[PDB]
Design a protein around this ligand. Structure first.
Ligand SMILES: Nc1ncnc2c1ncn2[C@@H]1O[C@H](COP(=O)(O)OP(=O)(O)O)[C@@H](O)[C@H]1O
Lengths: 75, 182
């Protein structure tokens, strides 16, 4: 504004930002899906107490005693 | 003092079990030694690494089944113990080795060493108060009531023509051919 005052060639009456007056899932809805929550804390506390024993569950290209099984020990 | 014995009808392929005086062997399933074949991973995956019965049927191609009863003549005595333990369990016996007398079945002219091995089990690991193991044909004769009788019977991998008569020990006439339905 003071610059506009001090500058003679600068005219006025200008709506500066000239603009355009602009004015302003289904898979679950199938005949066969059953999307169910496991109730994370419920199933978690359930399987949580179920201890799991392991004893060197080792398998990668390991030769000796052909059959192997993960979580070897018991708990 | 003794207790109620347990009528345990074994066999080359199927074991039958119930207490004394019962009319039905309440615990029947075949003779098999099953144990897993896969890599256990998630929690809740049943441990024990030897499973019988509902677990066996439940995990048929998942449990490596064994049949050490080489025509009834078993070799996995340790696993036999465990089979009895499965019976000893809350599933079938719910009791101890000393809490009840035992009754067991025997096929003819087997190697005595096997019997003695079982006796070692039954009176050292297990502690049977009193038992007796003998011919299944004799028991079948008790069921028929007949005394004079040629008993033709076959196990699962054992066949045996048993000519008996009033309990007369005629092992020369009495035979067995350890091969059958197995
Ligand atoms: N309907 C049937 N047909 C053929 N085989 C059978 C049938 N039922 C049972 N078996 C087999 O025959 C065997 C029964 O003969 P049994 O003397 O009881 O055998 P075991 O001495 O092996 O228990 C069983 O072990 C079983 O495997």
């Amino acid at each position: 504004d003071p610059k506009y005052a001090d500058l003679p060639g600068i005219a006025r009456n200008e709506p500066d930002v000239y603009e355009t007056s602009d004015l302003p899932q289904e898979e679950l809805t199938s005949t066969s899906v059953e999307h169910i929550i496991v109730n994370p804390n419920a199933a978690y506390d359930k399987f949580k107490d179920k201890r799991v024993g392991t004893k060197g569950l080792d398998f990668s290209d390991r030769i000796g005693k052909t059959k192997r099984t993960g979580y070897e020990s018991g708990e | 003092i003794a207790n109620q014995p347990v009528v345990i009808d074994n066999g080359s392929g199927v074991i039958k079990a119930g207490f004394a005086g019962d009319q039905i062997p309440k615990y029947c399933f075949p003779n098999y030694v099953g144990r897993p074949k896969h890599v256990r991973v998630m929690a809740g995956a049943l441990e024990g690494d030897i499973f019988i019965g509902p677990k066996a049927e439940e995990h048929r191609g998942l449990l490596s089944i064994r049949y050490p009863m080489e025509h009834g003549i078993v070799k996995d005595w340790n696993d036999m113990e465990r089979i009895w333990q499965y019976v000893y369990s809350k599933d079938q016996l719910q009791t101890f080795s000393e809490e009840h007398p035992v009754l067991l079945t025997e096929a003819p002219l087997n190697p005595r060493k096997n019997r003695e091995r079982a006796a070692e089990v039954f009176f050292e690991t297990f502690n049977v108060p009193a038992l007796f193991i003998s011919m299944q044909a004799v028991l079948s004769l008790y069921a028929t009531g007949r005394t004079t009788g040629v008993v033709l019977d076959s196990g699962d991998g054992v066949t045996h023509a048993v000519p008996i008569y009033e309990g007369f020990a005629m092992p020369h006439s009495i035979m067995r051919i350890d091969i059958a339905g197995r």
